[PDB]
């Protein structure tokens, strides 16, 4: 006995490119035997932070779906990725539910997601009409209205383009470097399914 199909975690964690936080992607992991012990024992991950279900308990408890929400955020902003937190990333870009069951994986990515001259290809939303609901993948790009006067669809006074650039540099502190993130929000539903742990069969 053995696994039938290893889950595409390599496709997510080791992805060639990672999207901005305001347009965070979501890979619907489905119908596969997941090995989480390989992820936990890795020494690269600077933050695992499992919620609800303990990390070692994962390898014999299993669910209907697993969504690997992924984005890039500087290190000090990582704490906002959690239930009940508040902040620019929590309010305007990515809000986790107050009741949550996942594991916010992260790792340093200075050598990949940055270069000598810096990088401006990552964006984040700085203004919005109101707070996000949980898992609200809002990819709005319209000019934000900050007042009563109309903005005329163009930048100006009381009108700011909602997405600003992180703009990293290799000289930034370790807490300010680009840390990739993967969330792994588990789910149950009326339909049974078995995205589940390894066989563990010694024989």
């Amino acid at each position, epitope marked *: 006995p053995n696994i039938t199909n290893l889950c595409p975690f390599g496709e997510v964690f080791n992805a060639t490119r990672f999207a901005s936080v305001y347009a965070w992607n979501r890979k619907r992991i489905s119908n596969c035997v997941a090995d989480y012990s390989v992820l*936990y*024992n890795s*020494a*690269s*991950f*600077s*933050t*695992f*932070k*499992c*919620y609800g*279900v*303990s*990390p070692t308990k994962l390898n014999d408890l299993c669910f209907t779906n697993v969504y690997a929400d992924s984005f890039v955020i500087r*290190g*000090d902003e*990582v*704490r*906002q990725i*959690a*239930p*009940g*937190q*508040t*902040g620019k990333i*929590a309010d305007y870009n990515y809000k986790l539910p107050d009741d949550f069951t996942g*594991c916010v994986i*992260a790792w*340093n990515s200075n050598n990949l997601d940055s270069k000598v001259g810096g990088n401006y290809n990552y964006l984040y939303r700085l203004f919005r009409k109101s707070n996000l609901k949980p898992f609200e993948r809002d990819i709005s790009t319209e000019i934000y209205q900050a007042g009563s006067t109309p903005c005329n669809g163009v930048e100006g006074f009381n009108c700011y383009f909602p997405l600003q650039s992180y703009g990293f540099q290799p*000289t*930034n*502190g*370790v*807490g*300010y*470097q680009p*840390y990739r993130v993967v969330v792994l929000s588990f789910e149950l539903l009326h339909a049974p399914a078995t995205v589940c742990g390894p066989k563990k069969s010694t024989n």
Partner: antibody
Amino acid sequence: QVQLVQSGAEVKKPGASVQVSCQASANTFTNHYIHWVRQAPGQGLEWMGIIYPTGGNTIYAQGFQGRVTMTRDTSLNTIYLELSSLRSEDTAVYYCARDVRVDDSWSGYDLLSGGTYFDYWGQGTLVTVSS
Amino acid sequence: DIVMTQSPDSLAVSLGERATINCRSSQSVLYSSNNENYLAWYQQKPGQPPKLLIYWASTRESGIPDRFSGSGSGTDFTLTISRLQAEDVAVYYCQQYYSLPRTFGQGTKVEIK
């Protein structure tokens, strides 16, 4: 009965390797992170890195990204340095400051969030380098 | 990178009086979710390692007497030592644990009379 001690004073040549380390009671330091703090005699404190003791996930300051690697030993729960390319600026004391994780919500480790503050420090291990 | 410098480099304190140690951060350490100001205050005597006094912005850690006190929010914070009578001459460090790399302060020496 002091419950945190270091490996004692060390001396090394420039370009050599140094293994300042501190062994501690594993009964309580499975669930506490542990940092490393530098201080020159004339200057203030400086930061070097954080080690989650069991897993060994590590983060280093940008100033010493390519000069230090830190290991573990789950049996003893002791942690070491590998500070290399020693120079006159490297003469300093090295405390393996502890942390207390505040939140009971999340399981697992987080080197960016669950650090909080330095509740306990080790005795000084003064390192000197000379020709 | 949460750079930091205390306003008072060194202060001469008359014995038994109250002395304040202002401590300014470059970036606000206040976190909106729980509204706890992330600073802690340390003191090291010569030779001995530093000892924490106040772990959040205000509340003092167990085992220390109630002589010390700290208050403030945002970026302006102060350590107020009251009735400086014992031999508490030392260098006082305030440091952020809001984000890495934990930039400690340069430290200020307190002197008696």
